[PDB]
Every structure is written in C-alpha cells, then in structure tokens.
Amino acid sequence: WKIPPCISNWKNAKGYTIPLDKRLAADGRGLQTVHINENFAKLAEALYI
Amino acid sequence: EVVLHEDKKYYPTAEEVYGPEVETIVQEEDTQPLTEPIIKPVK
Amino acid sequence: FKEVGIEFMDLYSHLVPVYDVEPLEKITDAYLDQYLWYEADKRRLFPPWIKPADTEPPPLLVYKWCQGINNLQDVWETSEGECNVMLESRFEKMYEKIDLTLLNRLLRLIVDHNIADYMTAKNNVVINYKDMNHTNSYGIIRGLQFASFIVQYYGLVMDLLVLGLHRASEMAGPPQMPNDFLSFQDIATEAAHPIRLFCRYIDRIHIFFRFTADEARDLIQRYLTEHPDPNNENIVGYNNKKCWPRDARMRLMKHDVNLGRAVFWDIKNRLPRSVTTV
Amino acid sequence: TAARPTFEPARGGRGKGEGDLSQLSKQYSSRDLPSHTKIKYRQTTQDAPEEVRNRDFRRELEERERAAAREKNRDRWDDDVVFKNCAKGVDDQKKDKRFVNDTLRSEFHKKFMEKYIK
Amino acid sequence: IPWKVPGLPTPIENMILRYVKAKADWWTNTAHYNRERIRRGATVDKTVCKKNLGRLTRLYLKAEQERQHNYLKDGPYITAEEAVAVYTTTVHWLESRRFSPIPFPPLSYKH
Amino acid sequence: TMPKPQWHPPWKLYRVISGHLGWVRCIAVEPGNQWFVTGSADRTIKIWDLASGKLKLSLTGHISTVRGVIVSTRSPYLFSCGEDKQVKCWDLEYNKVIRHYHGHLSAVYGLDLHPTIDVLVTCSRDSTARIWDVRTKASVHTLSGHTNAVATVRCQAAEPQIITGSHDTTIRLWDLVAGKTRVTLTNHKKSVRAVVLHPRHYTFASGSPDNIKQWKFPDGSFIQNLSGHNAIINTLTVNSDGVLVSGADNGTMHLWDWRTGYNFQRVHAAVQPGSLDSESGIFACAFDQSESRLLTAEADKTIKVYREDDTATEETH
C-alpha cells in the first residue's frame, strides 16, 4: 500500500530539479508498441506489379 | 473482411453482456413534456 | 520535415483547421504549387468539369449550368415518358482518406518522381497542439501550399470512377480538339448516355440525368430488387426543400421518389467506401 | 502558499440563524420575504395516505407490467462501370440502437464531431 | 497521453481512473452543451467561446490520434484490388489524353 | 448454529434502464408505484415509469451533482439536494421549483422528510445537519457535533427522531426539539455512509467498510454484527419481510436476513457495454411500495431492476 510520489510533466511548484529517468518515467507512452499490419505488403506489391 | 474506422465495433452488445432474460432499456428524450404535469390537480 | 501546428478557426457552426508550416518549407511549397498549376494548365491535365477555374466566378458557373440545362436537346419534353434527375452531393471524407502510398503512385503517374516523393513525404508530418503530438499517416494536410493540386487531381480520379472512361472522354472530347465545359461534339454524343451534365466543385458533385421511361423503370427495378419497400416508406425519409412555397417544391410521387433514390443508389455503388462515400 | 487546496471545509453553526439567529439581526434578503406560505396537501384522488394504506400494490404493479409487456409485444446503359454494388445486404446496421458508456466512442459524440468540424 | 504509474496499488489506480472518467464526462457534456448554444446563437460569454474552441480542438485531436492508430493497426482500407482498379483507370485515362508528364523544374527555366 | 434463518427467495436482475449521462447518485419511489425519481451527476432529475421502465420526465435546474431525492407522502412535492449547495422543493403540480432552502456552507449529501410534521432534514459536508420547515423555508435547528462530512440521515415519528451517520466514524442520535445529541455511537472504525430503519421491529442498521451493525433505538444497544460484505458500502435498505440489501462502491451487493444476520445471496452485477471494469459501483438502492422490486442506481450510469426468483428452495445454508 505504498504510494510513490507524483513526478509531473507539467507542474514543478517548488522549482525542483529531477533526474531524467525519473522525469521521463511515463511507462504508458513507452509500452504503446507501434505495431504494423500485414496487408500493407499486399497493397504495395500489387501496386508495383 | 476489412473493418473500416466508421464501424470499428468495440464494446459488445447489451444483450450479449446481460443475456436474453434481462431486457435492456435505452432511454433518450422523454414522453409528456414539461407542460404536461406529474400529479394532477383536482379539476 | 519539421512539425506543423494546428488551430481551429471558429465559424460558430463548424470549425475549420488552420495549419502552421515552417517558413523555408512554406516558400518551397509555394513555388512548387505555382509550378505545378502552370505546368498543369499548359499540359491540360484537368478537364473543364474541374470547376474552380480561373475565368469563371461561381455565379457565372451557376449561370452556365442553367443555360447548359436549357440548351440540351428536348430536355423539357415529357410526352413519351422522360425524366430529368438532378443529383447534388459530396465526397464526404475525401481529404481524410487519401492513402499516401496510392497518392505517391498517382503523383508518379503525373509528375517527376522527385516532385512526387516530396509531395508524398510532405503530407507525413507531426501535428502539434500545446501537448498533443501525432503523425498524419493516413490523411493529407489541407494547409500545405500545394494541397489544392492534390485535391483537384484526386477528385479527377474519382470523377473517372463515377463517370467511367467512355463518358468522361465524350465530355472532355478529343485531345486534339477539346471542347469547353457544357458542350459536346455532336447532338448524337449528347443523348448517347443518360449522364448529360457533370461538374465537380472542390468536393461537391453535380450530375444531370436524362432518362427515357424504359431506362428509368429498369433502374427502379434494380433498386427495388436490392432494396424492396412493401410499406411505401420511401416517401417518408425523402428530404425536400422547405424554402420554396408548397406549389414550388418537389411533389411526392412514387415513381419520382423511387427514381431519385435509385439514381442516388447507382451513383453510390460506384465508389468504394474506403476511397470516399456519398 | 496563496494557491493552495482546502483539506478541511468551513464548519457551520456560526452565522445568521445558528444558535441565537446571529443575535437577532435586522438584515434580511429579498429571497427571505414571505412566499408560498401555504403547504398544498394531497387530495383524495391524487395519492392521499388514506388511499395508499389499503391498496395492494403488487397486483396493480403486475397488471401494469403485463400491460406494458403486451404493448411492447403488439408494437413489435452504363453497365461497364468498374465497381458493382458495394452495399449488398447493409440494412442500416443499427448503431442508433446501441448505447455506449464512453464519451469518446459514443454515437452521439461521433455525430457531434462529424457535424461540428470540417 | 497514456497514463500509467509503474508501482501503484490497483485500488488507488482504479479509483483515479474512475474519477478521471467522471471529470471527462463533465468536461465533454459541458462542451456539447456550449457548442449547441454557440451554434444556435444563444447568449454566450466570450470566454466560453474561447474555452469551447479549446475543448473542441482537444477532442478532435484525441479522435485523430485514435484514427491514425486505427489506420496503422487495421491495415489499408483500400483493398488492393480496388487500388489496382484506381491506378489502372488513371493510367488508361492519361494514355487516352496523350498526357505529357511534368518534369523537374529545369536548371535554366525561363519562367 | 444458535439461530435458524428464514428462507428468502433469491433475487435476479431483469431490467437495465439507461439514459443518464452521469453517475446515478440517488433513487426514490413514489407513494403509489406509478413512477420513481432518480438524480444523477448530469445535473438532472429523471421521472421514470416504474412498470414499463420508460423515461417519464427530465427536470433540469441543478448546477452540480444531485445527491439526494425524496418524494413527499403528505404533500405533492419533490425535494432534492445537490453538491450545488442547493436544497429544492419541486411542486409536481407544475414541475417547477417553488422553494429553495438556503444556508448550507458546502455540498449537501442527503435529505429526509419527517413522516408527520412537515420538516425536512439535510446532511452536509460542512459537518452539520439542518432542520427546515417546509412552509417557511427557514432553519429550525443546526445539528452540529460531527467533525467530518455528514453522509446519511433518517427520520422517525417515535424516539430519537433524527439518526445520522457521518465520515467521522460516529453516529449521533438526536433530539429534534432541543437540537442536541443524545447518543454518540462510535463502534465503527471507518466512515458510516448508510443508516437504515426497520419498519416494524424498532431497530436500525448502520454500515461502514469494516462491518455492518444492528442497533436498538431508545439508547443504541449493540444487538448484532453483520459482517462479510467488506467494501465501502453506500446504501442499506430494509424490506418488511426482513430482507436487507447492502450495495458497495465496487458493485458488489449482498442480500441479508435482518433477524438472524445471515447472508443468503451475493450479487455481482456486470457493467454496461461502454463502461469500464473500475466503474462498477452502487450508490443507491430502494424497494418499491409493493416491496417486490429492487431499484439500484449504479455507477455505470444505469438503473438496474431486480425481482425475486419464483423457483422454490435450492438454498438453506
């Protein structure tokens, strides 16, 4: 039941300096996992043919 | 069998999540407008 | 390319995107747009139904359209059974759905491969608003200086899809002697097909149809085959113009309502919903 | 500092009507003038508690339920064009019956964003 | 921005998601209401016009990130038979009109 | 096994009513089973048809979330309260607000009508309960003595006439005449968010996330301890057949024997299609005047309606 602190991308009210790994610790935009489809291939190859 | 973005069906149907015995009621705008009243005066 | 900004112009009934491009890129795009339109008008790329043309104000466009309807052969005769149909519609998400790979393919058909690669890779930028960053991987950017050329040419491609190569070639005429906007080569080439007049304003379509009773009944038979109506419900959802008086609006006859819905159905089937819809 | 949250509310019991009527002030709002100085009561036809007391509610509720279910039951040239009929069996695909508990993926919001941005 | 705290108890995380969805609903319904008021011409403030524009562009870009993601996930919609039809129709048209392709703007172009 | 519990038939959902655009925070049934009110966080009050489940009216006028709604039994009125700080009387002859009750310093969380005097009582977040005359819209007393937000309040005709739990984990049994506390019951460890009154047996129940407790009325004696529904419970309601309903913030709802304190059914209902798994939750539940339907106001912006299963004993512990 421990609550880690809130390192915000917007508010720095007491003007602190936070290390980059703690600053860019937004996991959700790193696990977004840009994944492609397989029907791009059929389209591109058919257009070249 | 391509699904366009205009359909893109998430969130399966209310009959599919509650079942056939539960009857689902979706109510947008209402019967008897605000002039037609609740409990009627003695006329 | 560097990221472009976006904001919205509020027109109080709908919003319009306003795009913010880097100045060096904007100068290169503006010269490219000038060069593309000058070389397209020399080479006669756009046929005269691509409508925002230079020597035509939009009221002159409506005036030419009206006198072009009037100057069709036996256009007001209804004695043997003949109908006129006027379809006015749009290409609903025409901007939003231009696949940039196929756009590269068509632009490499038109211009040099370097210019076409520039125009394709220019549409794929990052859009920003105050926190928000995404990448335009599917649509186009309307605010590019040369986006007008891409829009009118993609609309030309879909005009070829709607009309077909034969009737569009009959409208454009021969390449050695092209005709102007609402004019054919012969009276016999006018009445060869039911599509008589056709213009395209930027994403607005205007077709005029002349039907004999046989073709009208056949096309209504095809619509009622694919979409039957046992309860006569086609007269309910039919919109009419409520601006004009009661004697002045379109009457609700079963034949005319079925013919209007059937002509709309036939034009609607000519476009894949992945390209645009109507 | 100046900009700060609350973390506790202001308590009641120390102003204008709280203990001694704030020691009997002679200040009164225009919203504190006499208005609706007569309680209306339920009449015999409306739902007076004399009439509500003897009523069997389950039989009447079952009858109205049966009537509602019965009402819902009794209610219910150029052949050479490169693309054929793309919509064959699309009988309007009842999205307007679905209701979604999501303000971004609702049908009303998709109609909203389709209407108000061009 | 997709919000995930790496270590956080799931009751706190679920409760925060619940109340953030509630504030999302309030924000969005207020935006719909004020947009209908601005459309009909009703009495509105100028600040509510600016706030409403700022909410509408933010909702549009949420939907637009959603649409670009659904395009990169769900493949082409174009169904390559149809794209070959489009390309081949354009080729037959451009050879029908005897079109001359636009060159690169030359090194000594007079215009 | 010291007691032998009465068999109660199990309950089942048969109707999911939908149409609010916010958390449905309150519900109440009309004295004649013709309709029922809900109040929600979309700042409206909706009259629903109780038989057909059809929206009968929608009443706008609140500036914030509607927290409590009650229909008067003596008078043709509809009292409502909100996070607005506003307490209102709706004349149902006209469907318009005729009287607004002013004086709450912060949000108003619940309200109840006295069954015989025409006196409204309200809970607020400013640690007070207020006592209002309906006819003169004035504060008779300000029940102060809780230290945190006041969550729920009830009323009797008989002794202690005002019973209120609050977020300071205490429950005060009051004097309507004097305006002072008679009994402070501190037995709960977490916040009391629902008190409920039995129609016959002159006892009451109270709920907090640790456990739920049953209590004699004159001075608050401990009688019993109903445990096992360990979530943040929001409402409790009593059937005259001795069925107690406990609905929680996590959507879980338990069905209980009043007398022996036995759990005969657990109901974990499912969310609406668009809704989220973290959004299952019950804020209100109420029986109809026939006491054969259970109306629950859910956190997925729904109203779920339950009735008894007509199949015989498959049950008994």
SS (H, E, C) C157-226: HHHHHHHCHHHHHHHHCCCCCCCCCCCCCCHHHHCCCCEEEEEEECCEEEEEEEEEHHHHHHHHHHHHHH
Q: What is the CA radius of gyration of chain C?
A: 22
Give CA–CA dist E53/E42, Å, rounded. Answer: 16
Q: Is C276 helix (H, G, I), strand (E, B) or coil?
A: coil
C-beta neighbour count of B28 within 10 angstroms: 11
CB F263 within 8 A of CB F255: yes
Q: Which two tokens stand for residue F119?
A: 């006196």
**Pairwise CA distance, residues F275 & B10, whole Å:** 11
**Per-residue tokens: F136:** 């003169």
Place of tokens 């009465």: F6
- Residue B41 burial (CB count, 10 A): 12
Contacts of E32 in chain D (CB under 8 A): 108-109, 112
Work out the number of other CB atoms within 10 angstroms of the CB of residue F298. Answer: 28
Phi, psi (degrees; rounded to nearest 5) at C26: -70, -35
All residues of chain B having their beta carbon less than 8 Å from the beta carbon of residue E75 are 2
What span, in angstroms and rounded, lies between the C-alpha atoms of C43 and C23?
A: 30
**Angstrom distances, CA of residue A18 to CA of A15, A25, A27, D1:** 10, 11, 17, 22
CA distance F37 to F44: 10
Q: Which residue of C10, C39, C165 is in closest CB contact with E93? A: C165
Chain E contact for A33, CB < 8 A? no
| Strand ranges, E, within chain C | 4-10, 15-20, 82-90, 126-129, 132-135, 195-201, 204-212
Please report the beta strands in F208-308, taking only residues with DSSP state E, as ranges in sequence order. Answer: 212-216, 224-226, 233-238, 243-248, 252-257, 263-268, 282-287, 293-298, 302-308
CA distance B4 to A12: 43
Distance CA C244, CA C139 (A): 39
Tell me chain D's radius of gyration from C-alpha atoms: 31
Q: What pairs with residue F253 in β-bridges?
A: F247, F267
User: Which residues partner with C16 through β-bridges?
Assistant: C9
Technique used: cryo-EM
| Joined tokens for residue F196 | 């409920």
Chains touching chain C, criterion 3+ CB pairs below 8 Å: A, B, D, E
E45 to A10, D95, E10, E30, E50: CA distances (angstroms) = 29, 35, 42, 14, 9
Q: Does B32 touch chain F (CB under 8 A)?
A: yes
C137 contacts chain B (CB < 8 A): no
Residue that is written with structure tokens 């043709």 in the block: F76
Packing angle, helices C147-163 and C23-42, rounded to 10: 40
Give me D59's structure tokens: 């039989």
Contacts of C15 in chain E (CB under 8 A): 53, 56-57, 60
Rg of chain B taking only CA atoms, in angstroms:
20
How many other C-beta atoms lie within 10 A of the C-beta of residue D78? 13
Q: Does residue E65 sit in helix, strand or coil?
A: helix
| Phi and psi, residue C54, nearest 5° | -70, -45
Give the gap in angstroms from C-alpha C106 to the nearest C-alpha of chain A.
10
Find out whether C64 and C88 touch, Cβ atoms under 8 Å. no
Which residues are E63's β-sheet partners?
none
- CB burial of residue F174 (10 Å; 0-12, 13-18, 19+): buried
Resolution (A): 2.9
Instruction: Note whether E81 and C43 are within 8 A (CB).
Output: no
Are C and F close enough to touch, i.e. 3+ CB pairs under 8 angstroms?
no
**Residue C236 burial by Cβ neighbours in a 10 Å radius (0-12, 13-18, 19+):** exposed
Contact D80 C164 (CB under 8 A): yes
Kind plus residue range of the DSSP H or E element containing F25: strand F24-29
**Residue type at A42?**
K
CB neighbour burial string for E59-88, b if at least 16 within 10 angstroms, e if fewer: bbbebbeebbbbbbeebbbbbbebbbebbe
3-state secondary structure of C222: helix
**What span, in angstroms and rounded, lies between the C-alpha atoms of E64 and F226?**
52
The answer to whether E77 and C275 have CB atoms below 8 angstroms apart is: no
Number of helices and strands in chain A (H, E): 2, 0
How far apart CA C7 and CA E59 sit, in angstroms, is 12
CB burial readout C159-182, b (16+ within 10 A) else e: bbbbbbbebbbbbbbeeeeebebb
Question: Considering only CA atoms, which of F150, F73, F57 is closest in space to residue F111?
Answer: F150
Is C110 exposed, middle or buried (CB count within 10 Å of its CB: 0-12, 13-18, 19+)? Answer: buried
Residue owning tokens 């959700």: A28
Residue C272 in contact with residue D87, Cβ under 8 Å? no
Q: Counting every residue, how long is chain D?
A: 118
In the three-class reduction of DSSP (H, G, I as helix; E, B as strand; rest coil), residue E26 is classed as: helix
CA gap F189, F187 in Å, rounded: 7
**Chain C residue nearest residue D92, CA to CA:** C227
Give strand pairing partners of C127. Answer: C4, C134
